[PDB]
Amino acid sequence: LAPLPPHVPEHLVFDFDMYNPSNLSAGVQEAWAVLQESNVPDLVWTRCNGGHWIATRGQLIREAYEDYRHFSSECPFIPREAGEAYDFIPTSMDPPEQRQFRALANQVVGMPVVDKLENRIQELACSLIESLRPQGQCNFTEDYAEPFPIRIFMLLAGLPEEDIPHLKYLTDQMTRPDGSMTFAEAKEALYDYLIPIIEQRRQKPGTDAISIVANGQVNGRPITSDEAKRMCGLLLVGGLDTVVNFLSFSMEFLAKSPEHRQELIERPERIPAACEELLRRFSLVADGRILTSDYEFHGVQLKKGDQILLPQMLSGLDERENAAPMHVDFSRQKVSHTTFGHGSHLCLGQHLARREIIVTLKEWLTRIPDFSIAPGAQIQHKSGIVSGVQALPLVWDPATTKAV
């Protein structure tokens, strides 16, 4: 526990630990939802992880994400030392500078790009599922979820298949840290892979995402090799652990709820709406901002340089946003959430993520309609900037399946 700064009133202190919440064994979302019990203020201070504010309700979370002038992305991670070394583009920049880097990134992951990849995503999901289907078991996280988005990235970025294991090792080193290296060391190792590929593609550009990025124009002039490197790093990692962990939460729920499975089996047209409801219920990202100046925010004095966690996860779990928030209903009329963020940094990959999810659910339920959590397995959750599932052992009877 970091000593309480003098400006923080005692009555706002709730020592929530975002990397190890108590009651984690009851499910991550549940463990974070304690921040929304009736005696917890809308805005609290925790002494864990260096000390930082947490906005606990959707209204404040949305408002802080809109107000980039007070709530800067310059240092977006807890703890402070990780936010400080983090330099990805555009996640470490504020508007107005961020605006055009965002425009460039959007050329590479936005809607028209997704509509063209739809089928390649489908062929990938199918071959992954078909290879598992006859075995009657998998670790979903390891055998389907992890191989999936890295392979879509390679397709986007025109990178060779043989690179996957190496790239996977580099990204895991950054995003699942075991404490053996600082974030800054993990970032440099990743940059060491990207640096030469950018050089090559600035000299000899093709039509992959890295060529488009490394040769784009920003705020009047050509992008620097440094800026391109910083963008490509985010393009790579931004779609990995979010998608892996999200698919894992989703499949865990479907494995545990035959009634919801059946609903989607009998009514496949509801899969896109079911995807949205799952995005809300199993929301999983929690980053934040640093105060650019002293600022009174909903009655609370915030001090220049204070960090604030603004959990994207919590908005849609908030009773004030969605009634009976822990309950899953695929026919919910107004599914509100900020699972992909809010304000100027609203996830550029959201459209690709939804096709990854929808395609996964469609293809899986079609080939393996009936599945369960392996007998005797207890599912372990992990908590962090991107919360997740440690392992997801699934079982099915292969006779209830069909090759398609």
Q: How many of the other CB atoms lie within 10 Å of CB of 26?
A: 13
Among ligand DSO, K ion, ligand HEM, none, the one that 71 touches (CB under a kind-dependent 5 to 8 A) is none
What DSSP element (H or E) covers 72?
A: strand 71-72
Both tokens of 251, joined, read: 């499949």
Q: Is the peptide bond before 268 cis (omega within 30 degrees of 0)?
A: no
Which residue lies nearer to K ion by CB, 92 or 338?
92
Is 69 one of the annotated active-site residues of the chain? no
Helix (H) or strand (E) holding 372: strand 372-373
Q: Which of 243, 358, 359, 379 binds ligand HEM (CB under 6 A)?
A: 243
Q: Which of 217, 187, 194 is nearest to 85 (CA)?
A: 187
Q: Does 90 bind ligand HEM (CB under 6 A)?
A: yes
Element of type H or E holding 55: strand 52-55
97-112 b/e (C-beta count within 10 Å ≥ 16 → b): ebebbbbbbeebbbee
Catalytic residue flag (residue 349) = yes
State yes or no: residue 194 binds ligand HEM (CB under 6 A).
no
Report the C-alpha gap between 289 and 308 in whole angstroms: 5
3-state DSSP assignment of residue 218: strand
Tell the smallest beta-carbon distance from residue 52 to ligand DSO (Å): 11
Residues found near ligand DSO in the complex (CB under 6 A) = 19, 49-50, 77, 79, 81-82, 88, 91, 174-175, 177, 179, 183, 234, 237-238, 242, 285, 287, 385-386
**Catalytic residue check, 48:** no
Question: Measured from the CB of residue 287, what is the shortest distance to ligand HEM in angstroms?
Answer: 5
Q: Is the Cβ of residue 148 or residue 396 nearer to ligand HEM in the bound state?
A: 148
**Residue 401 is a binding residue for ligand HEM (CB under 6 A):** no
**Of 167 and 285, which CB lies nearer to ligand HEM in the complex structure?**
285
The answer to whether 241 is a known catalytic residue is yes
Axis crossing angle, helix 225-237 with helix 183-203, rounded to the nearest 10: 120
Name the token pair of 326.
């822990």
Is 234 a binder of ligand HEM (CB under 6 A)?
A: yes
3-state SS, residue 2 = coil
From the list 278, 279, 347, 361, the catalytic residue is 347
Coil, helix or strand at residue 160: coil
CB of 135 to ligand HEM, least distance (A): 27
**347 is known to lie in a ligand binding site:** yes
Identity of the amino acid at 304 = K
Of the candidate residues 341, 384, 388, 393, the single one contacting ligand HEM (CB under 6 A):
341
Place of tokens 């915030």: 302
When asked if residue 235 is in the footprint of ligand HEM (CB under 6 A), the reply is yes
Part of the chain binding ligand HEM (CB under 6 A), chosen from 251-259, 269-277, 300-308, 347-355: 347-355
- Considering 91, 242, 338, 360, which one is annotated as catalytic? 242
For the chain, the straight-line distance linking the first and the last C-alpha, in angstroms and rounded, comes to 55
237 binds, among ligand DSO, ligand HEM, K ion, none (CB under 5 to 8 A by kind): ligand DSO
CA dist 15 and 49 (Å) reads 9
CA distances from 41 to 14, 73, 200, 298, 352 (A): 9, 24, 53, 11, 36
Partner from ligand DSO, ligand HEM, K ion, none binding residue 19, C-beta < 5-8 Å depending on class? ligand DSO
Q: Which two tokens stand for residue 332?
A: 């919910």
Catalytic residue among 43, 124, 284, 348: 348
Q: Which residues are catalytically annotated?
A: 176, 241-242, 347-349
Binding residues (CB under 6 A) for ligand HEM: these are 73, 76, 90-91, 98, 102, 105, 109, 234-235, 238-239, 242-243, 246, 285, 287, 312, 339-341, 345, 347-349, 352-353
Binding residues for heme: 347
**Residues forming the site for K ion (CB under 5 A):** 86, 92
